[PDB]
Amino acid sequence: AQAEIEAERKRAREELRKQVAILAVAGAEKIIERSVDEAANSDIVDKLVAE
Amino acid sequence: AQAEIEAERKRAREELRKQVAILAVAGAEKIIERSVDEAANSDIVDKLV
Amino acid sequence: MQLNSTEISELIKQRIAQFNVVSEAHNEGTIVSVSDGVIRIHGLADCMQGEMISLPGNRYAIALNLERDSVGAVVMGPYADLAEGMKVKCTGRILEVPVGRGLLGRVVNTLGAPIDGKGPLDHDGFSAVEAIAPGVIERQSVDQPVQTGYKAVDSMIPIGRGQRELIIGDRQTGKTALAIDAIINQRDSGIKCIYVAIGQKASTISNVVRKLEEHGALANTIVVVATASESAALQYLAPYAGCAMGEYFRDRGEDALIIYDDLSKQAVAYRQISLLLRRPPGREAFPGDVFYLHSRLLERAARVNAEYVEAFTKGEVKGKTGSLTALPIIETQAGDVSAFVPTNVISITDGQIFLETNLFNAGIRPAVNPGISVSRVGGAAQTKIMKKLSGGIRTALAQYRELAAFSQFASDLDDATRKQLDHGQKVTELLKQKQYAPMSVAQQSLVLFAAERGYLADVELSKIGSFEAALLAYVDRDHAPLMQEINQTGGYNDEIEGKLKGILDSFKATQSW
Amino acid sequence: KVKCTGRILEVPVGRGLLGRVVNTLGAPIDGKGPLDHDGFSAVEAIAPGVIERQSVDQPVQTGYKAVDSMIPIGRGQRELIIGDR
Amino acid sequence: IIYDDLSKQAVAYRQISLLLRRPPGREAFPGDVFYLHSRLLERAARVNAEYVEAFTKGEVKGKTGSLTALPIIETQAGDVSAFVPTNVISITDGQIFLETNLFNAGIRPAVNPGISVSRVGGAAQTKIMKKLSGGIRTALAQYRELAAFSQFASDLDDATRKQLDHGQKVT
Amino acid sequence: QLNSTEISELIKQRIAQFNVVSEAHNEGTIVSVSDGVIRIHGLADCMQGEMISLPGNRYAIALNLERDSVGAVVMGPYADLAEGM
Amino acid sequence: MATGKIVQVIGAVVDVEFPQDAVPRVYDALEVQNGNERLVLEVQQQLGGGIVRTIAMGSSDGLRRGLDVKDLEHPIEVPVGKATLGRIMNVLGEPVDMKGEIGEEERWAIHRAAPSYEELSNSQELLETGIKVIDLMAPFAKGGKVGLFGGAGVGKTVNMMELIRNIAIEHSGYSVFAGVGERTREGNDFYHEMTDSNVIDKVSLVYGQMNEPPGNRLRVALTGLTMAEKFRDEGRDVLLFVDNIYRYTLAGTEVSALLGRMPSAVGYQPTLAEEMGVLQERITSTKTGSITSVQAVYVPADDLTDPSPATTFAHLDATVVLSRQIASLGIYPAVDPLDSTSRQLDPLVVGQEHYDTARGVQSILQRYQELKDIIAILGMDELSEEDKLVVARARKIQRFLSQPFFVAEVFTGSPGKYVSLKDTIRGFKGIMEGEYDHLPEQAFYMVGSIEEAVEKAKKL
Amino acid sequence: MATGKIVQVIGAVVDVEFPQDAVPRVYDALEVQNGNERLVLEVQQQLGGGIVRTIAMGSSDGLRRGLDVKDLEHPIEVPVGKATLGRIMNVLGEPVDMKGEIGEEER
Amino acid sequence: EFITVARPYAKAAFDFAVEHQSVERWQDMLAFAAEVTKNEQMAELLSGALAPETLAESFIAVAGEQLDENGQNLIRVMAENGRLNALPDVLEQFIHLRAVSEATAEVDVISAAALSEQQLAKISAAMEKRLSRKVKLNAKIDKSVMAGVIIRAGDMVIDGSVRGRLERLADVL
């Protein structure tokens, strides 16, 4: 019985973590979309063209 | 145990609404590598809750 | 234990911190077609036959056809959501599976992903699924017993480590029961166990896992699952993953036993995947190489000599000889052994335990059929005491069955055959036992001694299950020091003969059934 | 050159068909002159649905002791007659 | 309505479908042979009074329409496991099996009872016939059970001899 | 969509001048070899049943005069043959 | 906006060409105007560039090349819930009973994954049918599967009608009936039997009739499964009646032959066992609820060896064997007591009393089948006096496990009877032990509980 | 010098393309570097346009398209004579026995 | 789709164009034919059951700007086989074959905005070292990338876009 309760605790913890993962990464997406500058895009491209 | 874990999750959910405020700009400033614009949380209210 | 949401926060923060920002070149193709589980890919100039191609959604396809301008691959999982125009990436890997002790005692699918819900595996390295068997010179003869725990099989049909024994019979005759009882009996031998289920309905796997952990055998076995509803590609490749997971132990000088549940369903899944690729058919629509489907599998069940394991493990193990024992299961229709796939697998294995349906319905369980069932490795894999006690039983029972077939037409029959037709009827009533009750070599041995040396000749009323149970309880109380000797050595002596005479005499004279 | 009529195979139908020998297109072939049909009907049609049916509870008599007693046929039934040549 | 040799409509359709290069199924019959016969035979129906009254827009009331179908099928040496026989045996409400071993012996019409089924049963009989038919069914069933002993008769008991020679008289 | 034994350098020969029949009708070239059956290109003069002479001392029998190639069988060991002969 | 155009029509198979941006994915539902009628197509294959190969659900007559096709971006999805009780629907979830719209509130796609082995609920709660022989000789638990094997004319459909009635006005649970490959006469008889018996308000009916394109007949089983799954998610213990699995396999064969797949062992489709698994693996009990199921299986030409009955056997938990010989002897239900079996028939789940009663009934009937030919040859007055008693007790058992059904009344006029399992065990256990050696044999024929046997003998 | 290119791989059947004039004969043996191990292909058919269809004397897994194939100008050749007494060999005349090497004088 | 039927014709046309030092003219001739293949009326004629010879002549007529060697032979050979609808692919294969012999690669680059022409020249010179060819970059302005660039060099691709890294992170979780 305690093993089955532990399995359900695992389930609930993972579900909560996955919801916060989705929303956190979506917020990161919107941040990166709004907060950007050419002096940063050129830096990213200059890191890419290095290899 | 079911009733224990239920209220435990319900308590967690409210605090993760604070922690997402860090984690979202964390995922942003990991990606560009540019220090993110803090105070750009003008948008974050809909992402908070 | 969850209010500490700082735990969630620290998990996420570790996952962010350890995200890697740079990117690497990869080779990419486009899905041009998708249907019935097969997809055609355009591009992937460097795809190699048998490679694993990664689809969007963390699942794989196996590149089977490298045609001149497209790659025909089979999806391993739900294909219906794929669509033309999606892009796929070529992994540098020929079909892998995880291996090692770390997945010992866990439930996994054909790709080694855990369907158990208990976290990730801890394997050591990966193994190629489609490997090659040891050669003629790297092999050794099989002369070590593996005990199935069933009196009928351990006495009449001995199995050896490195043997391949076919469990063949009609539907619903105790094949899966015999197999998982042979697994449970390995709780405490050095043999690791592997159970591959092909085309089983999920409730059967749930019951099998509950029984394996209930009787304490789960910690010593790997369960590989490809359920009846999963894509045929997953069912066709499951036994090869199981064989690789057991060959990991074989190659390290240890002993493994692997049970393939319904190879006769792997053949159907392969027929499906073959016809969907337009490959020419054969005798019953099964493709041409269906023999080379089971052969190149069951030839991996082998006992391997000490030099092979020493050279493979680069000198880290010296005295051990490795082995892998296979018990494939085959389902016949109305007992026609001479069907196509059954007569192939009977031509591959080294014996068969034929389970007869009209014995099973008559309450004779396990319903092993003597005569038609044999072990061609035989007594070399049988412990000495069992070999001594069991020599007559098989022929005595076959002749009893034919004589009892004659009997129905002949009332008032000779009093000499009247005794054979009763001893046979008692031995056939003795060799049947409850399902999840495996019996050690000593408990089988003294029961067969009681039956063979006439001590049953006065219990001719068929109150004979109680006799067996009471004899086992009696011997377990008093003479445990003899059962220890039998179980440890398996030896037999005139002194042990006298000891067993004494036990039986003292039991008959002083106890009740 | 081929022209596409928008029509679908239709066949004559009516009581005047009763007692005639006719080919599959409705033309008389017995030579007893034209048909006294009652309009035309579409060859390919949709059967009545579930709610339009009624239960078969009326006999259609064959006059054979072997059939009417042990293999009854009702009005609205479909009975296969199967055998060798 | 009698359809004489639906097993020849099936052959004509196989020809048409093979000349159009359509994918051949079993015995080279096309895949949709079942959907050929079913949408034919499902047109044989009994129809309730409201459908008739609505279809004719009045002018008929109270009456129920009907259309009875008796399709005929030929089997090669009595095998039922063929393609077209399988489809049509699956579609219809019952079967009358005519057998050559009975026809040769003089039993005409050579209907084989027991092997032949009608699922409408007594619902399609006059109550006198429904009353009288049950004893014929049971008599022929007991006769079929005993018929193995016919060529060993005069060995049998008299109580079963009576059943055996009663089934012969019904036949 | 499948090829019909038209290949790059034969197409190139037709590209050089379409009417390659200005060359001899007396000869051709082997195009494929499989299990004793042979496909030949050219041989505009071939007639069904004719003996076609191969390098070495061997014969083939022209069974098929198709639109562009002759199908024949080899009367002897065929493994010695190769494309372009 | 519609973006696809028809490019081929060959029988029931339609090819539709879309922009390469918007290719519908597999099992999506497209829609087209077949004149004034509305026809939906199910995408079977994404062959080639932009083209899609589909099966028409309605009839394909009247279609022409170049028609505009509109793609619904979801599979065929049907209404579910309380709203569907007492209604008749086709594979598309449209009402075919003229009682107007369904009143739907939610719609579910008919294609979905099966429960994982971790979500299953191990259970052994036996169902209690009203039928003596099935309760005794072949018990089955919630979430289990039962196959009514037999030829034609043996009583599968009326047995399922009786089960629906008994488990709808004795135990008041819901039920779903998926008539795949239905005969319109039998479907109307079923509708009128359920409406006359007041049970119609607890049965949800789906019909795919025999005069419809193959795939229309094929997807009906999944439609009924989806309705049963919606009722399961509400926590109910639903019961799903599949009217013939053999016609489901035939519809799969037809649709596989139309798509030009390479055929298999006996002309069956290659995917036979995967279609059977995708059907039968969704029918399971789970921790929230359960779907029990009973399936009629026609065995063609009387062999259990061809791919259809052979492949369905792997999934059933109980098998009832009906015989036309027993039916022709006038005994209904025509269950063969010796050949019907169950996995749940062992002392550990049914109790020793039930197990012993069943094994004793089978032993008595086997001994009678042995004695029958000594009776035939040497006459009965030669049997030993204990064998002359085995004969009578077997002959009374063989009567007592017949029964009058409530739905069989229109065939016989006599009223039906519902028999509890306790009364069944009490009756058989009494007969075998000689408590009723004084009653005639006909006192047991077509009676309910043993009390009716004693009362009929008292009347007889 | 290798001259052919693998063009298809379907199970144990491998198609390789050669220059129009260098096409191998019917039972000739080709070979390929399947990773580190060499693999021998026995030709079975000559298709049009320099393509040749062969069967692999080994495991077909791991073969890319476009791999270089070397055309041996002779069929499979095996050692013969006294040297082979008491040994064990596979089809290709290679010792699967582990007693070293076969000192054959002739193939 | 008929890549496989176009391969032989493209290879023959190219292998002939280098025997006569006119690859550049052949490319535009095939481009003209590939365009005539697309017309709505010509596409109606090509579907009909005309004789290959007269159907070839009905195709020569609409293109007089062709060599004796090129049109009047290649179009006729393709007509005898009924392959004319393959012309749009016989072109592309031809182009591809050329780029192989001329040791060239048509690397494609994708970005959220224009590159500085120092970034782009560095990309050129770096790809010419990654590969062993003269590259010929062409850029695309795709906004969904948002930042960074995708470099596609045939079946090889290098993804440096912020969206790719974002949705990779989304699956690291």
Ligand SMILES: Nc1ncnc2c1ncn2[C@@H]1O[C@H](COP(=O)(O)OP(=O)(O)OP(=O)(O)O)[C@@H](O)[C@H]1O
């Ligand atoms: N030794 C035994 N004693 C009593 N019952 C048994 C024994 N062995 C098996 N059974 C019973 O027989 C039934 C069928 O067993 P099992 O599933 O092992 O046979 P099977 O051939 O694997 O079935 P199938 O192959 O049809 O899935 C089981 O429900 C089990 O309880």
Ligand SMILES: Nc1ncnc2c1ncn2[C@@H]1O[C@H](COP(=O)(O)OP(=O)(O)O)[C@@H](O)[C@H]1O
């Ligand atoms: N219990 C019963 N009482 C009376 N008649 C029955 C009974 N069971 C079956 N029948 C007869 O069998 C006929 C068809 O039975 P049905 O259930 O359709 O068989 P199938 O399993 O072939 O569908 C019915 O017309 C009915 O007259």
Ligand SMILES: [Mg+2]
């Ligand atoms: Mg089993």
Ligand SMILES: [Mg+2]
């Ligand atoms: Mg039925």
